[PDB]
């Protein structure tokens, strides 16, 4: 292939998220890096799907609920930031307190 470091980081995220979601479908509450991976992949998928920055923000609040992660993970995650390519280019997407 010919992956930039940024592109590879993006794939890692997709791979960590699939691993995470498999664990979620087995009934395991997610840890902090697993949650970050799931939420980050959600931003990447959104931008890939043509979603706007705002629709990605809007939707991301509903991806993991407090009950889906281990105790303490929500206060470990006041902010996630992910760069994704939207229709006008590369943008840093901010998810504030995504998990409640």
Cα separation, 88 vs 66, in Å, equals 33
Residue 27 φ/ψ region, left for φ over 0, alpha for ψ in the -120 to 50 degree band, beta for the rest: left
Only one residue has tokens 């292939």, namely 1
**x/- track of binding to a copy of itself for residues 57-96 (CB under 8 A):** ----------------------------------------
Contact flag: residue 6 with a copy of itself (CB under 8 A): no
CB of 80: closest distance to a copy of itself in angstroms? 10
**19 vs 78 by CB, closer to Cl ion:** 19
**11 vs 97 by CB, closer to Cl ion:** 11
Quick check: helix, strand or coil at residue 89?
A: strand
DSSP letter at 29 equals P
**19 vs 92 by CB, closer to Cl ion:** 19
């Amino acid at each position: 292939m010919h992956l930039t470091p940024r592109e590879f980081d993006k794939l890692v995220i997709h791979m960590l998220s699939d691993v995470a979601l498999k664990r979620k479908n087995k009934g395991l509450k997610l840890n902090h890096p697993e949650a970050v991976a799931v939420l980050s992949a959600y931003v990447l998928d959104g931008a890939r799907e043509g979603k706007t920055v705002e629709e990605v923000m809007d939707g991301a609040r509903s991806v993991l609920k407090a009950d889906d992660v281990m105790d303490g993970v929500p206060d470990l995650l006041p902010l996630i930031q992910v760069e994704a390519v939207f229709s006008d280019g590369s943008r840093l997407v901010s998810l504030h307190n995504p998990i409640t």
